[PDB]
Design a protein around this ligand. Structure first.
Ligand SMILES: [Co+2]
Ligand SMILES: [Co+2]
Length: 88
């Protein structure tokens, strides 16, 4: 499903796939097995470019995963200053 593919594209940092999937109706609110949204996976793997695309596409920046973490929280845990800046 488009959801699963979008979650994978975000996780992998494949913005080319994220653009196509979104343009094809992919749900930016999708969640994987741990309640992680595309925003969370892109953030966890530090794909700042995909994080920006998802935000511009309307992604809920405050979505919380199974551990109650937002993408910002993850970026802070990971010490990714560049990411935290975009998500602050
Ligand atoms: Co790319
Ligand atoms: Co990347």
């Amino acid at each position: 499903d488009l959801g699963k593919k979008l979650l994978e594209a975000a996780r992998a940092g494949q913005d080319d796939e994220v653009r196509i999937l979104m343009a094809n109706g992919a749900d930016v609110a999708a969640k994987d097995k741990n309640g992680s949204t595309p925003l969370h996976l892109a953030a966890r793997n530090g794909h700042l470019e995909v994080v920006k695309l998802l935000l511009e596409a309307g992604a809920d920046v405050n979505a919380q995963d199974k551990f109650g973490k937002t993408a910002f929280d993850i970026s802070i845990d990971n010490g990714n200053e560049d990411l935290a800046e975009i998500l602050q």
